[PDB]
Coordinates of N, CA and C in Angstrom, one line a residue:
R1 N 21.2 2.8 -6.8 CA 20.5 3.2 -5.7 C 19.1 3.5 -6.3
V2 N 18.3 3.1 -5.3 CA 16.4 2.9 -5.7 C 15.9 3.8 -4.6
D3 N 15.6 4.9 -5.3 CA 15.0 5.9 -4.5 C 13.0 5.4 -4.4
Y4 N 13.2 4.1 -3.6 CA 11.7 3.9 -3.3 C 10.9 4.9 -2.5
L5 N 9.5 5.1 -2.9 CA 8.5 6.4 -2.3 C 7.8 5.2 -1.7
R6 N 7.9 5.4 0.1 CA 7.3 4.5 0.9 C 6.3 5.3 1.3
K7 N 5.1 4.5 1.4 CA 3.8 5.0 1.9 C 3.1 4.3 2.8
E8 N 2.3 5.0 3.9 CA 2.4 4.5 5.3 C 1.0 5.1 5.7
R9 N -0.2 4.1 6.1 CA -1.4 5.3 6.8 C -0.7 5.0 8.5
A10 N -0.9 6.0 8.9 CA -0.9 6.1 10.3 C -1.9 7.5 11.2
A11 N -1.6 7.2 12.1 CA -2.9 7.9 13.2 C -2.1 9.2 14.4
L12 N -2.6 10.2 14.5 CA -2.2 11.3 15.8 C -3.4 12.1 16.1
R13 N -3.4 12.0 17.3 CA -4.3 12.6 18.4 C -3.3 13.8 18.7
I14 N -4.6 15.0 18.3 CA -3.7 16.6 19.3 C -5.1 17.1 19.3
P15 N -4.8 17.8 20.1 CA -5.9 18.8 20.5 C -6.7 20.0 19.7
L16 N -7.7 20.0 18.9 CA -8.4 20.7 18.2 C -7.4 22.8 18.4
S17 N -7.6 22.9 19.6 CA -7.4 24.4 20.0 C -5.6 24.2 19.2
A18 N -5.1 23.3 19.1 CA -3.4 23.3 18.3 C -3.2 23.1 16.8
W19 N -4.6 22.1 16.1 CA -4.4 21.6 15.1 C -4.8 22.8 14.2
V20 N -3.7 23.1 13.1 CA -4.0 23.5 11.8 C -5.0 23.0 11.0
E21 N -5.8 23.3 10.4 CA -6.8 22.4 9.7 C -6.7 22.3 8.3
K22 N -6.1 20.8 7.4 CA -6.0 21.1 6.3 C -6.2 19.7 5.4
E23 N -5.9 19.7 4.4 CA -6.5 18.2 3.9 C -5.4 17.3 3.4
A24 N -4.1 18.6 3.6 CA -2.6 17.6 2.9 C -1.9 18.9 3.6
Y25 N -0.5 17.9 3.9 CA 0.4 18.9 4.5 C 1.7 18.6 3.6
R26 N 2.6 19.4 3.4 CA 3.8 19.4 2.2 C 4.9 19.7 3.4
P27 N 6.1 18.5 3.1 CA 7.1 18.6 3.8 C 7.3 19.4 4.6
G28 N 7.3 20.1 5.5 CA 7.3 21.2 6.4 C 6.1 21.8 7.0
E29 N 5.4 21.7 6.2 CA 4.1 22.1 6.8 C 3.6 22.0 8.3
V30 N 2.9 23.1 8.8 CA 2.6 23.2 10.0 C 1.1 22.8 10.3
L31 N 1.7 21.0 10.6 CA 0.4 20.4 11.3 C -0.6 21.1 12.6
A32 N 0.5 21.4 13.5 CA -0.3 21.7 15.4 C 0.7 22.5 15.6
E33 N 0.1 23.7 16.2 CA 0.9 24.9 17.0 C 0.3 24.4 18.4
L34 N 1.2 23.9 19.2 CA 1.1 23.7 20.6 C 1.5 24.8 21.5
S35 N 0.5 25.3 22.5 CA 0.6 26.1 23.6 C 1.6 25.1 24.7
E36 N 1.1 24.9 25.5 CA 1.2 23.9 26.4 C 1.6 22.5 25.9
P37 N 2.8 22.2 26.1 CA 2.9 20.7 25.7 C 2.0 19.5 25.6
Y38 N 2.3 18.5 24.9 CA 1.3 17.4 24.9 C 2.2 15.9 24.9
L39 N 1.6 15.1 25.5 CA 1.4 13.8 25.8 C 0.4 13.3 25.0
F40 N 0.9 12.5 23.7 CA 0.1 12.1 22.9 C 0.5 10.3 23.5
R41 N -1.0 9.4 23.7 CA -0.8 8.9 24.4 C -1.5 7.8 23.3
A42 N -0.9 6.2 23.6 CA -1.2 5.0 22.8 C -2.7 5.0 22.9
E43 N -3.6 4.5 21.7 CA -4.7 4.3 21.8 C -5.1 2.8 21.2
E44 N -3.7 2.0 21.6 CA -4.0 0.2 21.7 C -2.7 -0.2 22.2
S45 N -2.8 -1.4 22.6 CA -1.4 -2.0 23.6 C -0.8 -3.0 22.5
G46 N 0.5 -3.2 22.4 CA 1.5 -4.3 22.0 C 3.1 -4.4 22.1
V47 N 3.6 -4.7 21.1 CA 5.1 -4.3 21.3 C 5.2 -3.5 20.5
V48 N 6.3 -2.1 20.5 CA 6.6 -1.1 19.6 C 7.9 -1.2 18.9
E49 N 7.7 -1.3 17.8 CA 8.6 -1.0 16.8 C 9.0 0.5 16.8
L50 N 10.0 0.8 16.8 CA 10.3 2.4 16.7 C 10.6 2.5 15.0
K51 N 10.2 3.6 14.2 CA 10.6 3.9 13.2 C 11.5 5.0 12.8
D52 N 12.6 5.2 12.8 CA 13.6 6.4 12.8 C 13.4 6.9 11.5
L53 N 12.5 8.4 11.6 CA 12.4 8.7 9.9 C 12.9 10.5 10.3
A54 N 14.2 10.5 9.1 CA 14.8 11.6 8.8 C 14.8 12.6 10.3
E55 N 13.6 13.5 10.6 CA 13.2 14.2 11.2 C 12.2 13.5 12.1
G56 N 10.8 13.3 11.4 CA 9.9 12.4 11.9 C 10.0 10.8 12.5
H57 N 9.0 10.1 13.2 CA 8.8 8.9 13.6 C 7.9 8.3 13.7
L58 N 7.8 7.0 13.2 CA 6.6 6.2 13.2 C 6.9 4.9 13.9
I59 N 5.7 4.8 14.7 CA 5.4 3.7 16.0 C 4.4 3.0 15.4
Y60 N 5.2 1.5 15.3 CA 4.5 0.3 15.3 C 4.0 -0.1 16.3
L61 N 2.9 -0.9 16.3 CA 2.7 -1.4 17.6 C 1.7 -2.8 17.1
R62 N 2.7 -4.1 17.4 CA 2.3 -5.3 16.9 C 1.8 -5.9 18.7
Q63 N 0.5 -7.0 18.4 CA 0.3 -7.7 19.7 C -0.1 -8.7 18.4
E64 N 0.9 -10.1 18.8 CA 1.4 -11.0 17.6 C 2.2 -10.9 16.9
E65 N 2.1 -11.3 16.0 CA 2.9 -10.7 14.3 C 1.4 -10.0 13.5
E66 N 0.6 -9.8 14.2 CA -0.8 -8.7 13.6 C -0.5 -7.4 14.1
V67 N 0.3 -6.6 13.2 CA 0.2 -5.1 13.5 C -1.1 -4.7 14.0
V68 N -1.1 -4.0 15.2 CA -2.4 -3.3 15.6 C -2.7 -1.9 15.3
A69 N -1.4 -1.0 15.4 CA -1.4 0.4 15.0 C -0.2 0.4 14.2
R70 N -0.8 1.8 13.8 CA 0.8 2.5 13.2 C 0.6 4.0 13.5
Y71 N 1.4 4.1 14.0 CA 1.6 5.9 15.0 C 2.4 6.9 14.2
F72 N 2.1 8.1 13.7 CA 2.6 9.1 13.1 C 3.3 10.0 14.5
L73 N 4.4 10.2 14.5 CA 4.8 11.5 15.4 C 5.7 12.4 14.7
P74 N 4.9 13.4 14.1 CA 5.7 14.1 13.5 C 7.3 15.1 14.2
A75 N 7.3 16.2 13.6 CA 8.8 16.9 13.8 C 8.3 17.8 15.2
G76 N 9.2 17.9 15.9 CA 9.0 18.4 17.4 C 8.3 17.5 18.1
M77 N 7.6 16.4 18.1 CA 7.1 15.2 18.7 C 8.1 14.2 18.9
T78 N 9.0 13.7 19.9 CA 10.0 13.2 20.1 C 9.2 11.9 20.8
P79 N 10.3 10.3 20.6 CA 9.4 9.1 21.3 C 10.0 9.4 22.6
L80 N 8.9 8.6 23.5 CA 9.2 8.5 24.8 C 9.4 6.9 24.7
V81 N 9.1 5.9 23.9 CA 8.9 4.3 23.7 C 10.5 4.0 23.2
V82 N 10.5 2.9 23.3 CA 11.7 2.0 22.5 C 11.8 0.6 22.2
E83 N 12.5 0.4 21.1 CA 12.3 -0.9 20.2 C 11.9 -1.6 21.6
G84 N 11.0 -2.4 21.5 CA 10.7 -3.5 22.0 C 9.8 -3.4 23.9
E85 N 9.6 -2.2 23.5 CA 8.6 -1.6 24.8 C 7.3 -2.7 24.4
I86 N 6.8 -2.7 25.9 CA 5.1 -3.5 25.7 C 4.5 -1.8 26.3
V87 N 3.5 -1.5 25.7 CA 2.7 -0.4 26.0 C 1.2 -0.7 26.2
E88 N 0.5 0.0 27.4 CA -0.3 0.0 27.4 C -1.7 1.1 26.8
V89 N -2.6 0.6 26.9 CA -3.7 1.9 26.2 C -3.9 2.7 26.7
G90 N -3.2 4.1 26.4 CA -2.9 4.7 27.4 C -1.6 5.5 28.0
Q91 N -0.8 5.0 27.7 CA 0.6 5.2 28.0 C 1.3 6.0 26.9
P92 N 1.5 7.1 27.7 CA 2.3 8.1 26.7 C 3.2 7.8 25.9
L93 N 3.3 8.0 24.6 CA 4.0 7.8 23.3 C 5.0 8.8 23.0
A94 N 4.5 9.9 23.0 CA 5.4 11.2 22.7 C 5.2 12.4 23.2
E95 N 6.0 13.1 23.6 CA 5.8 14.5 24.0 C 6.0 15.4 22.9
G96 N 4.9 15.6 22.7 CA 4.9 17.2 21.9 C 5.0 18.5 22.5
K97 N 5.8 19.2 21.8 CA 6.5 20.3 22.3 C 5.6 21.5 22.0
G98 N 6.5 22.2 20.9 CA 6.1 23.4 20.2 C 5.5 23.9 19.0
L99 N 6.1 23.8 18.1 CA 5.5 23.7 16.5 C 5.4 22.4 16.2
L100 N 4.4 21.8 15.5 CA 4.8 20.7 14.7 C 4.5 20.2 13.4
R101 N 5.7 19.9 12.5 CA 5.7 20.2 11.0 C 6.0 18.5 10.4
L102 N 5.7 18.3 9.5 CA 5.9 17.5 8.6 C 7.5 17.1 8.3
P103 N 8.1 16.3 8.5 CA 9.5 15.9 8.2 C 10.0 16.7 6.8
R104 N 11.5 17.1 6.2 CA 12.1 17.4 5.3 C 11.3 16.4 3.7
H105 N 11.0 15.1 4.2 CA 10.7 15.0 2.9 C 8.9 13.8 3.0
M106 N 8.7 14.2 3.6 CA 7.2 13.6 4.2 C 6.2 14.1 3.5
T107 N 5.5 13.6 2.8 CA 4.1 14.4 3.1 C 2.7 13.8 3.1
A108 N 1.9 14.3 3.6 CA 0.7 14.1 4.3 C -0.1 14.2 3.3
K109 N -0.9 13.1 2.5 CA -1.7 13.4 1.4 C -3.4 12.7 2.6
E110 N -4.7 13.1 1.4 CA -5.7 12.2 2.3 C -6.2 12.1 3.7
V111 N -5.4 13.3 4.9 CA -6.0 13.3 5.9 C -7.2 13.2 6.5
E112 N -7.5 11.9 6.5 CA -9.3 12.0 7.3 C -9.1 12.2 8.8
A113 N -9.8 13.1 9.3 CA -10.0 12.9 10.3 C -11.2 13.2 11.6
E114 N -11.1 13.0 12.6 CA -12.6 12.8 13.4 C -12.6 14.0 13.8
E115 N -13.4 14.6 14.4 CA -13.8 15.4 16.0 C -14.3 15.4 16.2
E116 N -13.6 15.3 17.8 CA -13.8 14.6 19.2 C -13.4 15.8 20.5
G117 N -14.7 16.3 20.7 CA -14.5 17.0 21.9 C -13.8 18.2 21.9
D118 N -12.6 17.9 22.7 CA -11.5 18.5 22.4 C -10.3 17.9 21.7
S119 N -9.7 16.8 21.2 CA -9.0 16.6 20.7 C -9.8 15.7 19.1
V120 N -8.5 15.8 18.6 CA -8.6 15.4 17.1 C -8.1 14.3 16.8
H121 N -8.5 13.2 16.0 CA -7.9 12.0 15.2 C -8.0 12.1 14.0
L122 N -6.6 12.4 14.0 CA -5.9 12.6 12.1 C -5.6 11.0 11.9
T123 N -5.8 10.6 10.6 CA -4.8 9.2 9.8 C -4.8 9.6 8.8
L124 N -3.2 9.9 8.6 CA -2.9 10.6 7.7 C -2.1 9.7 6.7
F125 N -2.7 9.6 5.4 CA -1.8 9.1 4.5 C -0.3 9.5 4.2
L126 N 1.0 8.9 4.0 CA 1.8 9.6 4.7 C 2.9 8.9 3.7
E127 N 3.6 10.3 2.7 CA 4.9 9.5 1.7 C 6.0 10.5 1.9
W128 N 7.0 9.3 2.0 CA 8.7 9.7 1.9 C 9.4 9.5 1.3
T129 N 10.6 9.0 0.9 CA 11.9 8.7 0.4 C 12.6 7.7 1.1
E130 N 13.3 6.6 0.5 CA 14.4 5.7 1.8 C 14.7 5.1 0.3
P131 N 16.3 5.8 -0.3 CA 17.0 5.5 -0.9 C 17.6 4.0 -0.4
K132 N 17.7 2.6 -1.0 CA 18.6 1.4 -0.5 C 19.5 1.5 -2.2
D133 N 20.8 0.8 -1.8 CA 21.5 1.0 -2.5 C 21.7 -0.9 -2.8
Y134 N 21.6 -1.0 -3.9 CA 22.2 -2.8 -4.1 C 23.3 -3.1 -5.1
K135 N 24.0 -4.0 -4.5 CA 24.9 -4.9 -5.4 C 24.6 -4.8 -6.8
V136 N 25.5 -5.3 -7.5 CA 25.2 -5.5 -8.9 C 26.6 -6.0 -9.4
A137 N 26.9 -7.3 -9.2 CA 28.2 -8.3 -9.2 C 28.1 -8.7 -10.7
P138 N 29.3 -8.7 -11.4 CA 29.6 -9.0 -13.1 C 27.9 -9.3 -13.6
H139 N 27.9 -10.8 -12.8 CA 26.4 -11.5 -13.7 C 25.2 -11.2 -13.3
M140 N 25.4 -9.4 -13.6 CA 24.1 -9.3 -13.2 C 23.3 -8.3 -13.9
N141 N 22.6 -8.3 -14.8 CA 22.3 -7.4 -16.0 C 21.0 -6.2 -15.4
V142 N 21.5 -5.3 -15.4 CA 20.8 -4.0 -15.5 C 19.3 -4.4 -16.8
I143 N 18.5 -4.2 -16.0 CA 17.1 -4.0 -17.1 C 16.5 -2.9 -16.6
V144 N 16.5 -1.9 -16.5 CA 16.4 -0.5 -16.1 C 16.8 0.8 -16.8
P145 N 16.7 1.8 -17.0 CA 17.6 3.2 -17.0 C 17.3 3.8 -16.0
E146 N 18.3 4.8 -16.1 CA 18.7 5.8 -14.8 C 17.5 6.6 -15.1
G147 N 16.9 7.1 -14.0 CA 16.0 7.9 -13.6 C 14.6 7.4 -14.3
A148 N 14.3 6.0 -13.7 CA 13.2 5.4 -14.3 C 12.1 5.0 -13.1
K149 N 11.0 5.5 -13.8 CA 9.7 5.1 -12.5 C 9.6 3.7 -12.6
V150 N 9.6 3.1 -11.4 CA 9.6 1.6 -11.3 C 8.4 1.2 -10.3
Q151 N 7.7 0.2 -10.6 CA 6.6 -0.4 -10.2 C 7.0 -1.4 -8.9
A152 N 5.8 -1.7 -8.1 CA 6.3 -3.0 -6.9 C 6.3 -4.3 -7.4
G153 N 7.3 -5.1 -7.8 CA 6.8 -6.3 -8.5 C 8.0 -6.0 -10.2
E154 N 8.7 -5.2 -10.1 CA 9.6 -4.9 -11.4 C 10.6 -5.7 -11.5
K155 N 11.0 -6.9 -12.4 CA 12.7 -7.4 -12.3 C 13.5 -5.5 -12.3
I156 N 14.5 -5.1 -11.6 CA 15.1 -4.5 -12.0 C 16.2 -4.9 -12.6
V157 N 17.2 -5.7 -11.7 CA 18.0 -6.3 -11.8 C 18.0 -7.7 -12.6
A158 N 18.5 -8.7 -13.5 CA 18.1 -10.1 -13.8 C 19.6 -10.9 -13.1
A159 N 19.4 -12.0 -13.0 CA 20.6 -12.7 -12.9 C 20.2 -14.4 -13.2
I160 N 20.9 -15.1 -13.0 CA 20.7 -17.0 -13.7 C 20.3 -17.6 -12.2
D161 N 20.5 -17.0 -11.2 CA 19.6 -17.2 -9.9 C 18.7 -16.8 -9.3
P162 N 17.7 -17.5 -8.8 CA 16.4 -16.7 -8.4 C 16.8 -15.7 -7.1
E163 N 17.5 -16.7 -6.0 CA 17.9 -15.9 -4.7 C 18.6 -14.4 -5.2
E164 N 19.4 -14.1 -6.3 CA 20.2 -13.2 -6.6 C 19.4 -12.3 -7.1
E165 N 18.4 -12.7 -7.7 CA 17.4 -11.4 -8.5 C 17.0 -10.4 -8.0
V166 N 16.6 -9.1 -8.4 CA 16.5 -8.2 -7.8 C 15.2 -8.0 -8.3
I167 N 14.1 -7.4 -7.8 CA 12.9 -7.3 -7.7 C 12.5 -5.5 -7.1
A168 N 12.0 -4.5 -7.8 CA 11.9 -3.6 -7.1 C 10.5 -3.4 -6.0
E169 N 11.1 -3.3 -5.0 CA 10.4 -3.4 -3.6 C 8.6 -2.8 -3.4
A170 N 9.4 -1.4 -4.3 CA 7.4 -0.6 -4.6 C 8.1 0.3 -5.7
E171 N 6.9 1.1 -5.7 CA 7.2 2.6 -6.3 C 8.3 3.7 -6.0
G172 N 9.5 3.4 -7.1 CA 10.9 4.0 -6.8 C 11.7 4.4 -7.9
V173 N 12.0 5.4 -7.9 CA 12.8 6.2 -8.9 C 14.3 5.1 -9.1
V174 N 14.6 4.8 -9.8 CA 15.9 4.0 -9.9 C 17.3 4.8 -10.9
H175 N 18.1 4.6 -9.8 CA 19.3 5.7 -10.6 C 20.7 4.7 -10.8
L176 N 21.9 5.3 -11.7 CA 22.7 4.3 -12.1 C 23.9 4.8 -11.5
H177 N 24.3 4.1 -10.4 CA 26.0 4.9 -10.1 C 27.3 4.2 -10.1
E178 N 28.2 5.3 -10.0 CA 29.5 4.2 -10.0 C 29.6 3.1 -11.3
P179 N 29.9 3.6 -12.8 CA 30.0 2.7 -13.7 C 31.4 2.0 -13.6
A180 N 31.5 0.7 -13.8 CA 32.6 0.0 -14.6 C 33.6 0.8 -15.2
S181 N 32.6 1.7 -16.1 CA 33.7 2.6 -17.0 C 32.5 3.5 -17.9
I182 N 32.7 4.7 -18.0 CA 32.1 5.5 -19.4 C 32.9 5.5 -20.4
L183 N 32.2 5.8 -21.5 CA 31.9 5.5 -22.9 C 31.7 6.7 -23.5
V184 N 32.4 7.1 -24.3 CA 32.3 8.6 -25.3 C 32.0 8.6 -26.4
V185 N 30.9 8.8 -27.0 CA 30.4 8.5 -28.6 C 30.5 10.4 -29.1
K186 N 30.9 10.1 -30.4 CA 30.8 11.3 -30.9 C 29.3 11.7 -31.3
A187 N 28.8 10.6 -31.0 CA 26.8 10.7 -31.5 C 26.3 11.8 -31.4
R188 N 24.9 11.9 -32.0 CA 24.1 13.1 -31.9 C 22.7 12.3 -31.6
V189 N 22.2 12.4 -30.3 CA 20.8 11.7 -29.5 C 19.7 12.5 -29.9
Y190 N 18.7 11.3 -30.7 CA 17.5 11.9 -30.9 C 16.1 10.9 -30.2
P191 N 15.9 11.1 -29.1 CA 14.9 10.5 -27.8 C 13.0 10.5 -28.9
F192 N 12.8 9.5 -28.5 CA 11.5 9.0 -29.4 C 10.3 8.7 -28.6
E193 N 9.3 8.7 -29.0 CA 7.9 8.3 -27.8 C 7.7 7.1 -28.0
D194 N 7.2 7.0 -29.1 CA 6.1 5.7 -29.7 C 7.2 4.6 -30.4
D195 N 6.9 4.4 -31.9 CA 7.4 3.1 -32.5 C 8.5 3.6 -33.5
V196 N 10.0 3.4 -33.6 CA 10.8 3.6 -34.2 C 10.9 3.2 -35.9
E197 N 11.6 4.0 -36.8 CA 11.3 3.3 -37.7 C 12.7 2.8 -38.5
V198 N 13.7 2.9 -38.0 CA 15.4 2.7 -38.5 C 16.0 1.6 -37.7
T199 N 16.3 0.5 -38.1 CA 17.0 -0.8 -37.8 C 18.4 -0.1 -37.2
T200 N 19.4 -0.7 -36.4 CA 20.7 -0.5 -35.9 C 21.7 -0.7 -36.7
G201 N 22.5 0.1 -36.8 CA 23.7 -0.2 -37.8 C 23.3 0.4 -39.1
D202 N 22.4 0.9 -39.2 CA 21.6 1.7 -40.4 C 22.4 3.1 -40.7
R203 N 22.7 3.1 -42.1 CA 23.4 4.1 -42.5 C 22.2 5.2 -43.3
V204 N 22.6 6.7 -42.1 CA 21.4 7.9 -42.2 C 22.2 8.9 -42.3
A205 N 21.3 10.0 -43.1 CA 21.7 11.2 -43.5 C 21.0 12.5 -43.0
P206 N 21.5 13.3 -43.0 CA 20.9 14.7 -42.3 C 19.4 14.6 -43.3
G207 N 17.9 14.5 -42.2 CA 17.2 14.6 -43.1 C 16.1 12.7 -42.8
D208 N 16.9 12.2 -42.6 CA 16.7 11.0 -42.7 C 15.6 10.6 -41.2
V209 N 14.7 10.3 -41.5 CA 13.5 9.4 -40.7 C 14.1 9.0 -39.5
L210 N 13.7 9.4 -38.2 CA 14.3 8.4 -37.6 C 13.0 7.3 -36.6

């Protein structure tokens, strides 16, 4: 199981009168408090990809293959459009009703925003977790430990086949689940940070440097 940290820059328009002004929102934080309901309108046109995210929503808008917009609709703002709609500049994308919070797992960082008459345009650098499970067939050698910070482009699991190969899709903590066997050693474990002094199989006594 790899708990990839997914990252996305998306936008949201909301009325000043309702926006809670911050430079960052933590999974649950009160983004905006709307009195009267708000119809969030599409600021560009294209074919709509709906991204279902725990409790929040991410709209992607594609003209041809070039994504033209990325729209973020928080909690308490539910979609109006569906996978494959064609949307025109000003079509109500979602209806925001009451209080508007970040999802259970979504952090908003570095929210840059423009102030505009009565409306606010926020562009939010978003972060959340999307755990993917992976197959490991006998002739696949794990090359990473459990609980490992791993980078975009890192061979996690190796194989004699390039198609079978596993690469870490992005920044993600790697976990080890369901071991074909557990192995219990009467040993004593001594973690280290830089260079080791002692070779494997060696004889070692109380006080012997490791």
